[PDB]
Amino acid sequence: SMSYTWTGALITPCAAEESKLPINPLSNSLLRHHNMVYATTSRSASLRQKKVTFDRLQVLDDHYRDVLKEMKAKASTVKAKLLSIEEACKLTPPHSAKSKFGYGAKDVRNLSSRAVNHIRSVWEDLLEDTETPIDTTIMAKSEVFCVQPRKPARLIVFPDLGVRVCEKMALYDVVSTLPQAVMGSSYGFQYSPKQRVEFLVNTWKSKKCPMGFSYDTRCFDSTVTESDIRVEESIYQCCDLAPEARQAIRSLTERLYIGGPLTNSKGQNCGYRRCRASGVLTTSCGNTLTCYLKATAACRAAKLQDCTMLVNGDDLVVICESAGTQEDAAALRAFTEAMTRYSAPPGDPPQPEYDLELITSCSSNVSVAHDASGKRVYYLTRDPTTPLARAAWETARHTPINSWLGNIIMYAPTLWARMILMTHFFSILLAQEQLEKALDCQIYGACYSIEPLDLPQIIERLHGLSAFTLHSYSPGEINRVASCLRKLGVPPLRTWRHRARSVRAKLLSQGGRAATCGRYLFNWAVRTKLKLTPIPAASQLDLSGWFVAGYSGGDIYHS
Ligand SMILES: CCC[C@]1(CC(=O)O)OCCc2c1[nH]c1c(Cl)ccc(Cl)c21
Ligand code: NA
């Protein structure tokens, strides 16, 4: 069937949309080529619609069915509990889209009578009505990028707040535990960046003659079929479930997950969806299981030997045994045709790689540096173009989500996050005296409230003390960073070092946690290095639940 059917009504914005980076002294000191930074808007929605609208092709075979059964057998060991209204309400982000039924996120979190009563009625409706399609709103997503040598806005589809709370009650436990039970070590969201690197490195080292490749599915969500979504439900149904949870899952699958009507911000009917909605609780878990299922079966069909998968939603990386250059190229081509038959066609044809560092997965690649002892240490990095473009935007315009904070946390060991992001934002936090102000950021889709002053402890816990002592980065990494700065008009690294010396001094002069930031985060900025010992409060932080599962689009807030 067609991924989407459109009426002609436009995908509309619910307010003015900013698309250009402002000329601001704060952002200008970080990035001068402001005209190269832009944010997507509803104005490009039609271009996106054209690309994601097509008739799907899908042919399942014995390999697919064999793998599905293997996955279901593992799912059969799971027991999901069903969340209480209170637990579900608490998982709701303070700024989550309000309901069109008289209440907002603040009301849900406060357990107001109106919110609770409506949520209970939505729940009962899921139990009684097993067929009526549930309404969803479609909007153009606002994301910042650097112009290319532009991308149209992505389309986000989500149901009302009441429904979102019910999804949590019926499926939060399932999507938080089933993926790992089913895919084991291949489930990417169970790893912190350091653990992801460890898995990739050990997997690569375990092969007699390693070959790897990332597989980019062309607009994955639109390739997900009704069959795929019911197969996904068949996996969830293997869990021991409370009766109402089982019915809720069955109803949500038929009324929301497999498709439904699309309404714009103006309340007009835009069309119908018959593929994955980006904004529902099961999107991350569902995409991961679907991608893992198709890829695992495709490897068998393609005759790729000993394939180890690492899946994060629609992002896939595969490491296997090489059978020779020509043989690998042919097998990969076969893999792709198998994926295509499973309705997982390629965006960019995959390419075999024989250098782990040359593989980009989850927009990242493994690279190497050295710790204080001079010992080699692998870490996760990525092209800094987007992170920098967004940091500039977030500097000139106050945004709900602070991607720069999430990037500092996830890429703390990198050359660019240390010399640029840390230096830039801590200097601004010092000037505005807001070091104590907690900010929101996202990690694997979930929203987290974090205090900048806790960064040292957070980083130590996630990356280890070596994150504060890495030096002698690779030639390729340095070159990539440096060329990126020239392209964006970002001052050269030498300038950032100079700026950091002053930031570090100011931090030390304030003592307390501020001084600890100066000592650990900016030890790279002083000639005579300080001996960095474990931070006491670091072994007391509760990072439980930080790297357990993915929730992109799941409307999840962690406290
Ligand atoms: C995180 C900074 C690391 C390190 C040391 C290193 O990489 O050996 O710390 C001192 C300043 C500095 C470093 N790397 C740099 C590079 Cl590639 C370019 C320019 C400068 Cl000015 C630096
Ligand atoms: Na893709």
From Swiss-Prot:
How would you summarize the oligomeric state and partners of this protein?
Homooligomer. Interacts with non-structural protein 5A. Interacts with host VAPB. Interacts with host PRK2/PKN2. Interacts with host HNRNPA1 and SEPT6; these interactions facilitate viral replication. Part of the replication complex composed of NS2, NS3, NS4A, NS4B, NS5A and the RNA-directed RNA polymerase.
Q: Which reaction does it catalyse?
A: RNA(n) + a ribonucleoside 5'-triphosphate = RNA(n+1) + diphosphate
On modification after translation, the UniProt record reads: The N-terminus is phosphorylated by host PRK2/PKN2.
Ligand binding (Mg(2+) 2): 216, 314-315
Name of the protein described by the UniProt record: RNA-directed RNA polymerase
Q: Which residues carry this modification: Phosphoserine?
A: 29, 42
Q: How is it placed in the membrane, per its record?
A: Single-pass type IV membrane protein
The subcellular localization recorded is: Host cytoplasm; Host endoplasmic reticulum membrane
| Residue stretches making up the RdRp catalytic domain | 210-328
Q: Which cofactor does it need?
A: Mg(2+)
The role this protein plays is: RNA-dependent RNA polymerase that performs primer-template recognition and RNA synthesis during viral replication. Initiates RNA transcription/replication at a flavin adenine dinucleotide (FAD), resulting in a 5'- FAD cap on viral RNAs. In this way, recognition of viral 5' RNA by host pattern recognition receptors can be bypassed, thereby evading activation of antiviral pathways.
Instruction: Quote the record's cofactor note.
Output: Binds 2 magnesium ion that constitute a dinuclear catalytic metal center.
Activity regulation per the record?
Activity is up-regulated by PRK2/PKN2-mediated phosphorylation.
Write the span of the intact protein that is present: 2420 to 2982 of 3010
